[PDB]
């Protein structure tokens with residue numbers, strides 16, 4: 416009749432949830448995502464660094480139920496562009512999400528279906544409300560891993576497809592040790 | 605047109621979310637909740653301590669949306685019984701909840717509508733999954749404030765009344781400076 420309640424441990428310093436489902440994304444998994452494709456290729460052949468890892472505790476896709484996951488987003492740049500998660504829209508556009516920043520320095524880039532953009536800086540303790548209808552990506556703007564916990568409806572779904580093709584209308588770069596949020600040159604949509 | 609995304613800061617050491625709606629619950633707000641009623645009256649009339657504070661960031665009661673709140677559960681006892689939150693079932697039964705422990709030592713007592721209870725220990729970094737259909741209450745079993753963040757569907761609602769009259773089937777006590785989960789001596793059914 417009833418699902419079993421349970422506890423798991425999250426290590427706030429490493430992001431690891433022991434016995435969660437671990438996904439690893441290396442740079443080679445992100446062709447077409449970064450603006451500087453020649454820088455992408457070089458770094459892929461040279462080293463192919465891990466860009467991010469995810470530790471996810473997911474339920475069966477059910478309305479009213481919740482999933483949670485940590486992400487460890489590693490520091491680095493592709494050309495001038497900081498490492499980031501691929502980003503997605505939810506499959507059901509009526510699903511919100513909550514992020515809680517745990518370690519390091521980063522931010523969230525969000526985008527409406529039109530291309531209207533929003534940046535929210537994230538340091539430890541920051542809680543971000545991700546509303547329905549917004550595509551979302553996190554960005555590591557520091558020198559150490561950026562670690563966060565996300566809590567999201569079990570039936571939210573993921574649409575990675577649109578972002579893979581279009582990308583975000585903004586990019587986050589470093590020029591001169593200054594972090595800048597600027598127009599995506601490759602934005603024609 | 606769109607709901608605005610936003611970030612708020614949570615201070616992990618205090619539980620404070622500046623810009624949240626703050627709620628304070630004192631012992632006098634919890635008449636009939638504790639087993640030792642004489643100890644309850646004496647403490648109300650001698651001190652009326654703060655039992656817990658909540659900082660809540662809530663949305664409209666809409667499908668797919670999410671609320672979040674921190675709670676600061678203060679240390680203490682009423683007779684042998686540790687300080688706890690009032691507890692509730694959700695008013696919509698099939699709505700789950702995720703709790704993240706941040707500071708101190710505590711735990712969650714959960715119970716089905718059939719009266720079967722479960723206890724999950726919570727130390728900093730513990731994430732607790734509260735499934736649909738379970739009433740839930742947090743308990744501070746240490747000498748420091750127990751601080752946690754909860755994320756819950758915006759339309760889960762609350763049913764406080766049921767617990768107000770019944771209580772939980774188990775209580776959490778100190779006997780020999782040792783934490784025990786024992787039967788609620790008032791439990792008939």
Ligand SMILES: [Mn+2]
Pocket residue numbers: 503505512551567
């Ligand atoms: Mn998401």
Ligand SMILES: [Mn+2]
Pocket residue numbers: 692694701740756
């Ligand atoms: Mn609840």
